[PDB]
Every structure is written in C-alpha cells, then in structure tokens.
Write a protein that binds this ligand. Structure first.
Ligand SMILES: Nc1ncnc2c1ncn2[C@@H]1O[C@H](COP(=O)(O)OP(=O)(O)OP(=O)(O)O)[C@@H](O)[C@H]1O
Ligand SMILES: [Mg+2]
Lengths: 447, 109
C-alpha cells in the first residue's frame, strides 16, 4: 500500500554537453564592421571559463558562445592531423584540453587559448585590424595578462586591447551607480563594492566556489551514494546539467533538510535521472538508506530501467548551500557568502575614509551577476541573511541582473567605444614600449 | 558506409587545421615553457589576497546522507546521522571511508 498508491515515477533523461551544429563564419558581421563609423567598432570577447562569448560591439548579442576547449589528434589510419577548438570538440574522440586551470578564473594553457582565439576570429570572418575588448578575472595575474596581450599583439597584431572585469560590465549594463556587486560564475564567487561607478577592488573578496565546484561536488556525492557501483559512467558534464535543472537554494536549510528524507512526500522531493540502458521485521520500507538511494518505490537489481537511474534527494539543496556554509558542507574553509557580504557592508565600508553614506549607499543595491546565481530563492536567501546583520529597517534591496549570463558581454559591448573606454585602450606601439603587464586603470578594470 | 563517410565529412568540415589563418603572424613563436600553473606563477612572482576564513562555529552534517549529524565516529571519523548509518559506515569496504572524508576535503592522514 504505501508505494502501490503512488503513480509511476516521473524520470528525466541525462543531459550532457554535446556538439549540435556546424556554424559557418558570419561574414555579414565583417561587412557591417567595415560600414560602421570610424572608431566605433570593436571585437568584444568575454573570457568565460564556462563559455567564451565573442561578437561585435555594435550588436546586441554575441556571435559565438563557445567552451574554451581544444582537441588535437591524428587519425593514424588517415595520417592527416585534426584540430578542434570549441563545441566542435564533441563536448567523438573527446581528446580535449581546456584553456583555464580547473576551478580558477585564470587562463593557463596558452596554446589552447591561442587556438580558441583562432577559432573566434575565423568565425567572425576575419580576412586580414580591429580593436579588441577582453574581459579579465578580478586581480588577474600579471603573467597571465602579459601572455594574453602578447598573443593579441604579437600573434594577431590587433591595433588595441582593453581589459575589464565581467561582473563590472554587467553592473554597468543594469544602470549600476553604486552598489554591492555579487557574482557567482564558473570559476569563483566575488563580492565587489562599487562606489560612484568605480569598483573598490581593494575591498573585493573571492569565495573560490562556483558552478564548476558545484558540478564537481555533485559528482563526488553521486559516486558516494552509489559506491556499490552505478553502471552508467558518471561525468561532470552530466552533474552540471543536474545542478542547473534540479538544485535550488533552501530558504531555511536545517528545517528543510532534517525532514527531507522523511518517507511521506519523498516522491515529490525526489527527482530521478535516467541513464541510458538496454534490456532484452525491520525491512527496506523502514530503512533510511533505501529512501536516500531509491526513494519510496521498492527496488530490484533485475530491472535495467531501475538500475541506471540516480535519485538526487538531499543534494537537491545540499549542493547550492556550499555557498552559504562552505566549511561545513564541503570543507572549503572560507566564510560564507552572507558573512562575506556582511563583513563588507558592516565592517569595511563604514571604516573606509573616502566613502559617504555607507552602508546605505551600497546597501540600496546588492546586485547579482553570473550564471551560478540563477538558483531559485538565491536572492531571497541572500536578502534574509543580510537583513539580520543590518540595522533594523535598513533600505536593503537585492536585485538580479537581466539575463545574468549574457549581460556581462552586453555591458562591455555598450562600453567598448565610449570616450571612457578609448581613454583606456592600449595601442600596439604603447605595448611594445610598456609591455603586456601595463594597463590603463579604469572604473571597470583591475588596478 | 554512409555513416562513416558522413562522420568523416563532419570531421573535415569542422577541422581548423585544414584552414589557413591569414590573420596569424608566422614569425612569432611562443616560449615552450609559457604554460605555467597558478602556484608556479605566484611562486615566481614572489591581488589573489581576496580569500577570507570564517570564525563562526560550523554545523555538523552526516558524511553519508548529508542529514544533520549528532555523532562523530571515533574510529573512522565519519560523521553520521543515526545507528543505521553507523552500521553502514562500519561495513564499508576498506577504501571507502577515505572517500567520504575526501568529499569534504578531509583525509584520515
Ligand atoms: N539557470 C541556471 N541555474 C543555475 N546555474 C546555471 C544556470 N545557467 C547556467 N548556470 C551555470 O552557471 C555557470 C556559468 O557561469 P558564468 O557564465 O557566469 O561564468 P563564466 O563567465 O563562463 O566564467 P568565469 O567568469 O568564472 O570565468 C555554469 O556552471 C552553468 O552551469
Ligand atoms: Mg564570468
């Protein structure tokens, strides 16, 4: 009865990163880039560790959104070498390398990056001569900046280059004026105070947790849950789609958690992911570990359909909460997001001598940027966490960016050719004298 | 067979190596040592001083089920929810106990 009353389970197929289509080079964009007025055209590249986004500053969306990966091998029976540099890596050999150091925002495999840039300029239709706007990590390492700008000037010969922070471009695109910028991305999570459109990067803080770490942690958990052996090949690309589709932030974690595996209504809290298959008086119904692994239904190892499926359960909410409880849930040994934001608003900014109307100036706009903020209740959870730390009735608002993935590129595109930007451009002839570490300090860039 | 031919057609269609890059300077060639890890870069540089620890007391969760854990097992040092998970933990294969620690970055040694 307790299970026979239940309907047949709703089960979701696995999703994974895959090749979808050929994209021919967009030569129409190259023609427009020549027709548009002088000094008002640039190539805008957002170096997302999850997605390199590239396109024309005069256009409202990027032409490319491509993983920073390459593949290079010989079909030894065929002798010719093949090379791939984006979703043309079928992420069918999957002989792949990535430009970034895994779990960081910093480019580290420059041969991969150079092949990714080669792909970008081919697909934008380069027939070479065009200014480049390129996003950076916050506090991006000098050696990394030197190596990237060397590639831009020595290899590709571009006339000018400017470096700015993706979260700050996103803030500008959303009428940001003063505020606390909270970004969660693939690489990391940052809180940046912005005063009078200028970021106070000396008061920025990084969490070292992000969408990459969530997919990796979700994979560790699923491997442990099914340590007896899950017969499907668990991959981090699959758990990345699981974190997107099913995880959410809990409004009251311990209250929700402690009842999560309770047997009544577990078929609602549980969501079931089907891996592909081929087919020709104490007991389980009072065991917690059956609920954890297999939910309200009875289980049999005979069914190829009922093996080859993972039951998510507590990791639906346990995985996002590493942002809020990092040392408890994943041993990260860093302050949680609410404690970081609270430290900035309450301890740092009121002490800072040049600032006025702190916290209330910043507190009136806590701004959320980057894809890894898109969890359900992320904003309300951050609001209610800060509300307890602030003086009573303080004018706290938390706000989401529009389209919090692409909006960082749209900001750099809108900014790209303004007089503020063109005062920040470095020319090739400056680079040849100043070197690649030198930059024009500006409100959207590093010091 | 057409499936192999189509796959080889796609592989050739997608390859970048078959494509000449007129926009690429042939004379510049990179230093073969240029790929360096963050530790190497920081060690050679010796602002990535943006991380921060926390002083508040952390909550305790079960290493197996993630539910709250009243108990720390003195033998295997896994945190566990109840006696059922304590039984599971003590029955684990000899390698598995270190994996539950390592999922939260802990290790037994
Ligand atoms: N709707 C969504 N809900 C939750 N997470 C999402 C959603 N859409 C995308 N993500 C995740 O957001 C992450 C992408 O983050 P983002 O695009 O801000 O990073 P990035 O700019 O590529 O990287 P970085 O700035 O760290 O180098 C991925 O882990 C992706 O799985
Ligand atoms: Mg980003």
């Amino acid at each position: 009865e307790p299970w026979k009353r239940l309907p047949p389970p709703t089960v979701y197929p696995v999703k994974e990163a895959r090749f979808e289509k050929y994209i021919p080079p967009q030569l129409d964009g190259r023609e427009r880039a020549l027709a548009q007025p002088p000094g008002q055209v640039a190539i805008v590249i957002d170096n997302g560790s999850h997605s390199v986004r590239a396109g024309w500053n005069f256009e409202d969306k990027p032409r490319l959104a491509i993983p920073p990966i390459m593949s290079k091998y010989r079909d030894r029976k065929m002798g010719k070498t093949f090379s791939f540099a984006g979703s043309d890596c079928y992420a069918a050999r999957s002989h792949i390398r990535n430009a970034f150091e895994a779990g960081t925002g910093i480019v580290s495999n420059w041969d991969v990056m150079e092949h990714v840039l080669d792909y970008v300029f081919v697909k934008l239709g380069m027939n070479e001569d065009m200014p480049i706007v390129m996003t950076e990590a916050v506090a991006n390492l000098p050696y990394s900046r030197k190596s990237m700008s060397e590639i831009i000037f020595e290899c590709y010969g571009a006339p000018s280059l400017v470096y700015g922070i993706d979260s700050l471009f996103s803030f500008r695109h959303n009428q940001g004026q003063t505020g606390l910028v909270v970004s969660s991305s693939y690489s990391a999570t940052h809180v940046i105070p912005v005063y009078n459109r200028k970021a106070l990067l000396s008061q920025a803080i990084r969490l070292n947790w992000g969408g990459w770490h969530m997919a990796e942690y979700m994979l560790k958990l699923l491997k442990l849950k099914y340590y007896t052996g899950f017969p499907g090949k668990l991959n981090s690309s699959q758990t990345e789609h699981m974190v997107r589709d099913f995880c959410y932030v809990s409004l009251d974690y311990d209250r929700e958690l402690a009842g999560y595996l309770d047997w009544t209504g577990l078929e609602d809290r549980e969501r079931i992911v089907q891996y592909p298959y081929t087919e020709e008086q104490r007991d389980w119904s009072k065991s917690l570990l059956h609920a954890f692994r297999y939910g309200p239904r009875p289980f049999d190892p005979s069914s190829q359909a009922e093996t080859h499926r993972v039951h998510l359960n507590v990791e639906r909410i346990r995985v996002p909460e590493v942002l809020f409880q990092p040392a408890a849930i994943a041993g990260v040994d860093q302050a949680g997001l609410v404690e970081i934001a609270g430290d900035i608003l309450c301890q740092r900014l009121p002490s800072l001598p040049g600032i006025q109307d702190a916290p209330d100036a910043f507190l009136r706009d806590v701004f959320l940027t980057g894809g890894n903020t898109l969890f359900q209740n992320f904003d309300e959870r951050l609001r209610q966490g800060l509300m307890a730390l602030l003086p009573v009735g303080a004018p706290l608002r938390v706000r989401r960016a529009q389209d919090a993935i692409l909006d960082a590129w749209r900001g750099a595109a809108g900014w790209a050719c303004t007089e503020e930007a063109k005062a920040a451009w470095i020319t090739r002839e400056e680079y040849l004298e100043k070197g690649g570490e030198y930059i024009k300090e500006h409100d959207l860039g590093n010091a | 067979q057409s499936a192999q031919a189509a796959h080889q057609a796609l592989v050739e269609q997608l390859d970048l190596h078959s494509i000449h890059k007129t926009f690429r300077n042939p004379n510049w060639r990179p230093n073969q040592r240029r790929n360096k890890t963050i530790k190497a870069i920081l060690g050679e540089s010796q602002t990535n001083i943006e991380s921060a620890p926390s002083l508040a007391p952390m909550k305790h969760y079960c290493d197996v089920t993630g539910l709250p854990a009243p108990y720390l097992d003195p033998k295997t040092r896994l945190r566990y929810h109840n006696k059922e998970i304590f039984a599971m933990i003590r029955n684990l294969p000899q390698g598995m106990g270190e994996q539950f620690l390592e999922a939260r970055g802990a290790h037994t040694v």
